[PDB]
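User: Hi! Is it possible to get a structure for several chains at once, not just one? Here's what I have:
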Amino acid sequence: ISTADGAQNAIAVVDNALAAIDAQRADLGAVQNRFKNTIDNLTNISENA
Amino acid sequence: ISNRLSNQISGLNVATRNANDGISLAQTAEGALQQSTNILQRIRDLALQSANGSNSDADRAALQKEVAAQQAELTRISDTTTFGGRKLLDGSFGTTSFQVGSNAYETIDISLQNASASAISSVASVDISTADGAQNAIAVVDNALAAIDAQRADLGAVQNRFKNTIDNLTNISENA
Amino acid sequence: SANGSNSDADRAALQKEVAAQQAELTRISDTTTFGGRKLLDGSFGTTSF
Amino acid sequence: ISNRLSNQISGLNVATRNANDGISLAQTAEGALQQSTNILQRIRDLALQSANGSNSDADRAALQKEVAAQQAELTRISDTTTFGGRKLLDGSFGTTSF
Amino acid sequence: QVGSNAYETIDISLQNASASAI
Amino acid sequence: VNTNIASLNTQRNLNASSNDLNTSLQRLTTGYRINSAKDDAAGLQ
Amino acid sequence: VNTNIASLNTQRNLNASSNDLNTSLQRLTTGYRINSAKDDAAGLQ
Amino acid sequence: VNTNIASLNTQRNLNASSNDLNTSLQRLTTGYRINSAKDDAAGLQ
Amino acid sequence: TNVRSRIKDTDFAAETAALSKNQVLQQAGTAILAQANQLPQAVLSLLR
Amino acid sequence: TNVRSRIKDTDFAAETAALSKNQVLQQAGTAILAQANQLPQAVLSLLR
Amino acid sequence: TNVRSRIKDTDFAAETAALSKNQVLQQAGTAILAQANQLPQAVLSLLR
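Assistant: Yes, the chains can be modeled jointly so their relative placement is included. Here is the combined structure:
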């Protein structure tokens, strides 16, 4: 960071960059929902079998 | 009369088995469509989250990514229902028949929805990110979601038809 | 359906249930083949015992 | 007498359902008209704020703008009450039966 | 949007500009 | 008399009542008349 | 009858409800609907 | 009965009253009925 | 939520009545079969 | 902070309703299984 | 405001009486059904 010109450009870096973390955490959260729904159908196929 | 009659009784027993297997099959279809239903409700909710003019376009893209995940799940529920290996409702199911008596062609035809993933135009088509797509999306999933439930209606009625059929069936058995 | 608050779309859904039940009436009407000369659908000829 | 009677009982149960749905419908109408009521009270209040001869004509125009906003809200409460998609009270409701 | 149906929304009309246009 | 047609009927009405109880419990667990399709269109639609 | 398919269903709906309670407590401890990914994108993003 | 529609109503009227208190405190801190737009045109204009 | 309540929920005061009924019908039917499966034992009391 | 509040927080008046519901569902399901695991004991009351 | 008070408000000393009454009626009715749903169990004590 130490230079001011790097202080602002830094914020551009971590701004476009931080949202990739959260893009993943989004995806994985959805994948956990996909799991839960999958299981909810799964135990039904189990019971019906 | 006892040979023919006994053969009839046996056919009736086998029909109890087959009708009950049908109830269980249509049960599987019901549950899978409960999950696709909950999903497509969710997709509607995200379209409503996007219609918020204050929700920035970047986060609208994030919503779209969640939607796409949910859509992949619709493709999965669409698959994975392999009762017997000739699975329920994705792609092409051939509108089979379930016999419920002892005579040939004395069956219940059932009409599972040909597809779920791409054909509820498509749910997967929509790509919410733009506001003009947020509202039109709701039109899509509104006319579209009620086809799922039109089926779940039909099949629920078919399960009632099964139960009534069986209730008469065991009477014909007892009378024979 | 006579519930004025029940929307016309859901009235159509009710109608679909009804139609299913009607197909079941056609089935109970059939399927009663005592002897192959079944009971009550179509034309039964008023037999004697 | 048991078949007819049972059919009657079932109809009575369905009637409990339908009447209660009617209570809930008329409830929705009530609430929407609570909000339109509060608004039209408010519009009255602004007319009373305007009758103040000391209130300048420019600020009377400002009051009018608030009123117009409230009027758009009356159009919105008028809409948006889609119970079933055949909504309550705006435009033409056809005097149904329960 | 303030309901559940499409186009059931409140349009809002923020002033296009503040700096040079008041 | 081998068939013993009193038991047979009793078996029937027993399995019917037992289907009704199995469902009744299903209605009590989640506390919903509606848990699947076999109820109705008025159930879900 | 060994399978006893009333209990089986009850076991299911019990474990589902119990997952809902386990999460519900998780929402109450920190006092947040959001505590991890499994909620949503609307949760975090 | 799961829905428990007495609590639901109570939750509503509670959050409405609580909005009224939150604002009421906002009116007391600065000691002004007017602190933002949500009051009125008669408030500010 | 009122409407969905009257559709989708169960009033348990009705349910428990249905349970008590069904339980009585099962315990009954069982105890009935205790007799129906013993009426054929009246046979071999006759001529054996 | 208003926006993040409506996203990330929980209104506890809703939570406690969800708790009361879930607790009833568990205590119920337990007490149900007390019966489901005793219906097979009607068997050996019949023929043993 | 006096008139609107007597119309629109509730005097809570009346309300709490209505509550105590209703609560007693519910807890009662529940505990009653504990018996009404057990009177049919007197059946299978008879002939089973």
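The two ends of chain A are 62 Å apart (CA to CA). Residues 4-48 of chain A form the longest helix (45 residues).

User: Great, thank you!
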